[model samples]
Target: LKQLNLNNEWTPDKLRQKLQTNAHNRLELPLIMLSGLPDTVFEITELQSLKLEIIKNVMIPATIAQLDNLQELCLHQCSVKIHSAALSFLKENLKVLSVKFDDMRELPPWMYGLRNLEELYLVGSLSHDISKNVTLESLRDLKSLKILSIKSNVSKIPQAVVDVSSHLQKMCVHNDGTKLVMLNNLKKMTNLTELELVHCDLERIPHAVFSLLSLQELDLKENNLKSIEEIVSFQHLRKLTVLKLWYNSIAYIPEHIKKLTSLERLFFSHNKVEVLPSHLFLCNKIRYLDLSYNDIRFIPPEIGVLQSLQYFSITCNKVESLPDELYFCKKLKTLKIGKNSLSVLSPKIGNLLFLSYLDIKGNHFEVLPPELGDCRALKRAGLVVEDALFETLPSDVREQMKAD
Candidate 1:
């Protein structure tokens, strides 16, 4: 029903002649991508999803506890020695488990009694000694673990994840690029509601995530953060809403982030920011703001004091002016100020009327924005810009961007 469509040269005599003609015309088997599996695939039994690539030490025996409608289990570069009665029937019908070991392989010591795991992804290299490597008395009886990703090479945050930190709520750790020293156990995983610590060579901001405080979304992307000066300690995460410090080397941001009025989504793209704090638009429930490749020259016309602004990007900065209070953020939709050094394009940018993605290619604009064809969701594949400035617009705004 959803493309299991098994292949990869499976053979139990070509799967018993393709399960004896139509196999009752397919009843279940919703997914399967085997490499070296076939013990006649444990009589399938409505297999939900199973991927085993380049398998080796085999023996998943116990007839894999007759599958029992498995719910997604992937193991690339396999070597599953399963069968403690199929690991007690996949520790209660596996709820998404992905494993991809190869580098210094060693994570499936039956993977900590899954216990109805809700997403557990672990890639290469683990155990750079987590207090005498893997033994959590069934990893603190992991109960319905809610999403925990570890793109390994772990130098920190894995004391069996602080004994399953009371049912984690989304935690992604990618120290694969090494240097995690010690995350101080993320101040005891306080029911994290989304936290990604990518490329973990962090240079700051992990003061144990300002004590989680029921955190809501925080992705510290590609680390070595040059500065955040502890971002006014994010006003103690008043249920913080999505904040990603994109590919860092951040040069500055703390205007106390308008004391994070429950920020909606703010990503500081490729940093070295040259300035932006009009108190960051007073965090008026900002709906996605990415200050792209920074060194921004200026944007604060108090950004027309937003009231729920939509997606706005400051692509390639050093802006040569473009603020008529940014066309009064009437819920602006995707305006990615491309390669800045603008040369004026604001004809009130057609007072936005919900503009739909307008990039305005590498500005230095010489006439254009013929009221951007009265924006009605501007689309010519979201209008990126410059066909000699789209033939200098205004032929009925290029016939309303040719309607497509």
Candidate 2:
């Protein structure tokens, strides 16, 4: 009931009136969003969050300090120049700040003074040599910061960041141009829970990554990693739950992966993996597995051991048939095996009492098991077959399947 969102095109006077006539000494607008900042916005002393987007030539006047309660500020796709006075004044109160600008030339110098900030995301192309101009010194002032994301032309992890890594809970660095240098310094961030190094062209997992004992999520997507040979090194990451190794050259998942007993979600898609190592079934807690876009030809009966699996897919593989043990995974809700060479679906498929989505299209199926009708929970089923096969179904079954 106390939110002011002016996302639509409105007259400057219309927006100013709402801010001025709210008529209270301690005016509270939990949310305030606009295309451009108005002069009256600086008068609202109790605004908690402010978001400005698609604005040009905007300025953050020193009067912004009037918002004593302001904690979060986000600027997206804007061409605003922030002055030092406004930032220096807000430094005492601001805790979260995000800015994404097109063609950003340099980071505002005032950022170095916000020691109280806890979350900060600086997104932009800060020139090819931005790292040279901006060093860890700029971030050394922030002592309370917990989450920091920097998207720019960075070739190496600034020592300043590594110096503060102990205090950070999450860190994301996205290089807009070249690959990042060896990140051995990350070993110091023992308290970190999430670390993302996307599109960094990494040829192998950094040895320092294996020492993150507190990490819950580790994303190494879009790299050049050919093997997880060092996977055994992750025995220390007992807290890790989510692991992403997609779009890599990893042809085999080592047996050591079973050591990550806490892992729940695993992504191994878009790789050159030709076999589903039977040892992988030792991970009983995995509930979501995506091995699509690979050359896998078979799934061992050990897959049935994953009793907690809810969503599973092995699409675009060369698998010819499923093991009868698959029917034992009664908790499965989504099963996608499309674009394979499968010739028959076992009648035991109806044993999946909780299945709601089943995709088996793009295969060599000319018929479906009649027992499929027993899967009362089936909501959608994708199949490909000749018209003759469709005619064989009972009229009511055909109608129900068509409705789905």
Candidate 3:
């Protein structure tokens, strides 16, 4: 992994220890998060990203303006109280900013002056308008912005969101069952490549989104959608790569999905789907497909056509059999086909050279396929199966699995 996860380690004692030891001179701390109290952060002049959470009463000082490489900043439940520093220079170089409040808070005006800010996220409820109730603030001068996310209670997206249409590439909106009554301005965001309208109780995708000819990904999760055949119009989205419609009531996938020739990821889990349409198997470039917790009963033999498939999941469904051709997906790495009526194993499973994680529990498959011993990548921790069936494997192979 090129990036490290040190967000959970908000230990200032450890932080002071690193600074005391001159670790900053030798290490490349790309992203660092500190919370509770703040100090010793500005000393890392090379730090690229910093997140401050739940801090209080410490007015930001001028020392922060000296960090030349600082491009990203995130705040949680904190106000932006800055000292008399040359914000003109600091804002010019800052590219990313995020403000997450508990509620009833808004971004400080100094942030609006950040014309070069390329990515911004404003989470939590903000100032309310008497006529419109609570809503997102109207932003200004974010001309170079590319990705914008707003998770708040609003009747609709603020019209100012489209103000950066020329360069904006993605927009992610999230609300808790709040209906997004209008998104008409999205028609103007012609350059958007990805859009996520999640957690909003939208019955269907906003019509204006289809107007974006460059759109490649659409994620609409937890919306009250019952039918999505209107997606047949997606054939015009020739550049589409990801289609995520999870956490809905949709029951069928239109066979017209074969029209998405560039699709690479399909996350349609936790829905009411029952059958796998034959046309879905024609999406040969699909690398990650998730249909978990659905009502699927059969997987077509044509699945062998997905030679590029790597991660396939159908856990907690009604599937009773596996197609012989399913094993032909030689690139398979994570196969989660557990919690169903399966009772047999195909020796061909061993041919999946990249198989590292397999979930085969909650089924009465009588015997363990000894051929699985040939999969060098299978470790004991990731191979989820019944102990009784597992012991059936050859003693030598069983011991090797235990060793891992």
Candidate 4:
């Protein structure tokens, strides 16, 4: 008999009675969503998969003291503030756990002991120190862990960040400025596939780490990197396809990236690159190129040579005009030139037979180029100026005609 159904208004006493009967046979329940229920209110002897959501009630981590049989517990959008003892209680049988604390400030010390955990996710601005006593040794027992995501605004990277689960296949660590954590000797995870580190202060990355033959995607966005000199060769990573290095201080895209013959997507947006090397599109397999939010004053006509380039983004830059040759990039489908300093689009732009999306939202053109009317493939174009050649339009396209 399923006693905890929504059809009946369960009182505190009745709920407790139902829990008492199920406490010893917890492993059979595969999925359970508990909300607005008090801690220790449910019999967890049979629960293997549980989703704890925050409703009107307060279910702190302390409430997990009785769920000894839980293997997959997801606490998303929950108001569960955990203390040291409570964390230790949940660590006994946890395998897949996800905690999203919107504003949680502190985390417990013993929460790190789930040596059998397979996937762990902690999101939002949570605790900082996480108790100094909570050493890396506390989590070394989690031999089965594979995916770990640490998204916190705490600024400093915790030592525990790099301490656990060398068998991880995907690792994402984000911090602002306070932490100085280096991930060395990661060759232990020969199975790692994807790694992303954002808003970090990484100035140097050991090249040997790139030799991880199984890696496919690498994202190092929003770091304090001023250049790409440290990212040299990825000789053995034959599967690497996506490389995101956006929002860095990078002034140049290293030629070494071309060596990754399997690379298809390249993201170097929001940097200070003034010139793309003459042979920017040397790799025929390259598909996505994001050169947005940079100081580039022009799109080299040479970009048109990459017939395979399908997505081109050059938004918010110093570019004054689109080159006549851009129309030759027959495969170009997405043109993102919003918030740039362009006076007008070249008549050849209409020749991009395959163009599907054109974003000219924030440019200085006063009159819509007559040739644009011929761009039958254009599905989207932003802020077209209809005024005279050098006249200003609305604030949206105020500088359309004034761009040099």
Candidate 5:
């Protein structure tokens, strides 16, 4: 019922004594997080979860099975070896496992035997001959797996990965090598609800993405996408809730974004976008939207249609003014329009009863709106205007703004 976390200060004798002192069932130790695994850890038979982080030279012994009740294991940036017998012992009870290493030529043979695993994450640098040892055949047996993530250096989508998609509900692959020839293999993973392929140097959205009708979340950040002309493909993804395309070369937000009625969050920051289609506001389901670090020049009055929006940001742009309709977003809690060319802000901003955070730094405003102090919920304001504007605010409001 309790968990213990130990640092380097806790020696093997201290750890052993701590476990020995808690001998009664009233003080059960079900979880333990340590800098490294100590020999005393094997004695805690009731341990159900264990995490070892930043371990260097430790070699876990097969005796780990002595903790028969262990259900979760996480090894982060640790160079550790596990015997085949240890993997077999975990096959019966382990449900979540994560192993991350610096460089690995191939996946260990014992990894294929975890029949009861539901979530698994494998991260390492794969050698060029990954196909010879870590082929699709290696992952065919994980029928019970529902979530799987692989981070490695590879050129294309592994065929075996697609074959096992019939049961996987979430899959993420981070390829630090190069983009695939095509994502055609993903068309078969209809059961996937979340898919992420980041830092893969993709230049285009593969046509195969349009077929994943079941996807609710898709992230393609940090790629080479220059445009989203094929956005017509998005209409088919009726269930998508979140889409992220940050740090790319995209120049515009297609009007078809309105077709995704289920979208709740959208990110297009750090792109080349210069325009904001009014159609984007028609998707009333959006709760969070970010268009920062772009060349956007204007926001249409249609933005008032997003009545459910809670967080909206359009910072670092060339916008000169904001429409009065923006005040209609009563649900807005955070508004970031800083680093723009805004010459004036409507006093109607005070009508946003739920607004708590506002950023107006690096703007062209000559006078501060005393009405902003009327927003009872306003707690923080990023101010970079003239000192005369700051002096215009009430003494109390100035204190609150400065405190933030």
Candidate 6:
């Protein structure tokens, strides 16, 4: 029930004196200690929750046999570098174990032994590149694991995905390996609710990946797929809510995606798409749509049909005209159309009365479309366009606009 904040005052004598003064009275109460003085801090053992921040190169044992009541242990900004053995002293009664290693390069071998653990989070950890054989063997012992997220790692999914696919509810993988070939084994996992795969090398997404029926969120940003067929196959995922296909090689929005009535957020920035399927504008349930960095030449008149649309973007495209029908969408709050082949605005641009943020940073233009100044609700406007030219924005922003 007590909260103690540690500063630079911690020393061995002060910590030892506090422990000795409260020795008899503190046995039943949880003792919380925070320190860089590793030796004296680990001496007191009855804490209910123990947390450590900023651990330097020092000896930290794995096992806490004397502290039987220890329930949670969180190590932040620390490293698990040891030569003799992993800390064999970690308390067995632990309910939570969170270790964040921002400076460490490799994992200690002792991590696999925490069998009684209920929850584990290794955030900002180094990339682990296990050959295909090792990944296949690592999951046979992890029966209690329910959430697994591996980010910023080497390319290639371990075949171990086949063994634990059924027990997983969330899985995120971010690596630089190109062409994930051994993914066919992942179909066994039917319980997955949220799935994210990024930073891989594949010319086209394998058709086998969209088979997970229970999925609710899918994030496939920063991949090498040029066509929309890989995602079109996901028609069976009726529960899908959020879809981010940003930073891809696609050139157009597939009309078939209108079937996903439950979708709420769709990001398609930084792509090569020249034309969007008119059906996309009619998705009544969609709220956020990002269509930045494409080759679009115009906005269809049907765009006003998105009754539920809140935020929309068509920045950095080749759009020369917008239809007057776009004004019926009163729910729009953000309209970003910077760095494109546009010299004029739609006559009905004033209809987005709810607009809050409008950016036209790099568009080739000699003057502002007369209706733009009429947007009474427009809050922030990026007025960087100086002349009518091909590339109007910074290369970086334009790069981001291309949702590829």
Question: Compared with the true structure, what per-residue lDDT tens digits does model 3 show for residues 1-404?
Answer: 11123323434455545542112233333223332334455666766655556553335667777678777767666655666564766667888878787844434556666678888887777433412421323344766888888777655656666566768787888877787765667777778888888877887766776666778888889987767666667777888888888888888877777777778888889888888776788778888888888888899888988889887888888888779888988898988888876778788777788889888888777667677787778888888877787777888988767787
Which window of ten consecutive residues has the lowest lDDT sum in model 2?
Answer: 21-30
Q: Report the number of clashing residue pairs per model.
A: 1, 0, 0, 10, 0, 27
Q: What is the lDDT of residue 209 in candidate 1?
A: 71
lDDT, candidates in the order shown:
0.72, 0.71, 0.72, 0.62, 0.71, 0.61
What CA root-mean-square deviation does each model show from the true structure? 15.5, 6.2, 6.6, 9.0, 6.1, 9.9
Give a tens-digit lDDT track for model 6, residues 61-132.
Answer: 443455666655556664444323323444245545555567553233455455455455555545455453
* Model 1: per-residue Cα lDDT over 58-160, one tens digit each: 5566787777766667676666667687788888777777777784343466767668877778766665775666543455666888888888766766667
What residue pairs are clashing in model 4? Answer: 26-45, 26-46, 26-47, 27-46, 115-141, 115-142, 364-399, 364-400, 364-401, 365-400
Candidate 1 vs 5: which has more TM-score: 5
Whichever of 2 and 5 has more TM-score, that candidate is 5
lDDT of 4: 0.62
Angstrom error of the Cα, residue 80, model 4: value is 7.5
True-structure lDDT of candidate 6? 0.61
Off by more than 4 A, model 2? 1-37, 43-58, 65-70, 76-85, 101-106, 127-136, 381-404
Cα lDDT of model 5 by residue, 1-404, tens digit: 11134333555556556642222223223224444456567766766666556664455677787988777766666655566678678777778767666645223445567778788777777565545655445567776787777777656666766767777777877877577554777887878888887767777776666678788888787777766666666777788888888887888776777777778888888888787878877778899898887788888899989999998888878787688887878898878888887887787776788887677777767767677776767764444445666777888878765665
Report lDDT (Cα) of residue 106, candidate 2: 30
Task: After the best TM-score superposition of candidate 5, give how far the Cα of residue 133 lies from its true spot, in angstroms.
Answer: 3.6
Off by over 4 Å in 4: 1-95, 100-116, 123-144, 152-166, 206-211, 230-232, 380-404
